[PDB]
Write a protein that binds this ligand. Structure first.
Ligand SMILES: C[C@](CC(=O)O)(NC(=O)c1ncnc2[nH]ccc12)c1ccccc1
Length: 167
C-alpha cells in the first residue's frame, strides 16, 4: 500500500489521473519521479521546465554537471539523478521528438527504462511538444511497462479522451 490517491486503474500495473505531476510529486514524495527530458537535460518547458522550477533550478545545476561529465543521453535512453525536494530520485527519460524527425519506434525503448524501477510517478512520454499522439503513447506505456506506474496527465480534455478511448 502506498500514498497515491485518486487514480483510475487502467491495467494490472498502469494507473492514470488528471493532475500536475509537480503537485503530485510535492504531495506524495515518491521514490521515483520521471522527467520527460531531452538528450541535453535542458529543462526549459513542459514537465521538465516545471519540475526544474519547483527545485529552484537545482535540477538544472545537477544536470549540467552530469552532461559535462558524461555527454548527452541517447534518444530512448535515461539517467537516474536526484529528485531534490520532489522525490528521492528523478529518472530523466528521453522519448523521441517527432518534430525533429526522431523515430517513433524509440518510444517503446524510452518506456523500457521504467522497468528498472518498482514504482514510478510519470508523465506520458513524447506527448506535447515532442509531437507524438498521446493515445499512442498511453498504448505503448501499457504494452511496455511491467512495474507500477502512476501517470499524471495535465490536460483535462486529453485525460478524458485517453480514458474514454482506452481499450
Ligand atoms: C502536455 C503534456 C501531456 C499532458 O499530460 O497533457 N503534459 C505535461 O507537460 C505535463 N504533464 C503532467 N504534469 C505537468 N506539469 C507541468 C507540465 C506537465 C506533455 C508535454 C511534453 C512532454 C510530455 C507530456
Amino acid at each position: 500500500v502506498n500514498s497515491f490517491s485518486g487514480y483510475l486503474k487502467l491495467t494490472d500495473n498502469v494507473y492514470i489521473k488528471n493532475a500536475d505531476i509537480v503537485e503530485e510529486a510535492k504531495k506524495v514524495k515518491p521514490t521515483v519521479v520521471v522527467n520527460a527530458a531531452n538528450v541535453y537535460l535542458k529543462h526549459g518547458g513542459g514537465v521538465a521546465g516545471a519540475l526544474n522550477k519547483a527545485t529552484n533550478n537545482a535540477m538544472q545545476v545537477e544536470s549540467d554537471d552530469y552532461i559535462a561529465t558524461n555527454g548527452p543521453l541517447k534518444v530512448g535512453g535515461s539517467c537516474v539523478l536526484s529528485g531534490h525536494n520532489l522525490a528521492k530520485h528523478c529518472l530523466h527519460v528521453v522519448g523521441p521528438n517527432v518534430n525533429k524527425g526522431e523515430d517513433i519506434q524509440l518510444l517503446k525503448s524510452a518506456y523500457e527504462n521504467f522497468n528498472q524501477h518498482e514504482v514510478l510517478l510519470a508523465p506520458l512520454l513524447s506527448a506535447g511538444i515532442f509531437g507524438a499522439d498521446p493515445i499512442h503513447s498511453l498504448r505503448v506505456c501499457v504494452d511496455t511497462v511491467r512495474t507500477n506506474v502512476y501517470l499524471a496527465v495535465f490536460d483535462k480534455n486529453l485525460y478524458d479522451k485517453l480514458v474514454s478511448s482506452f481499450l
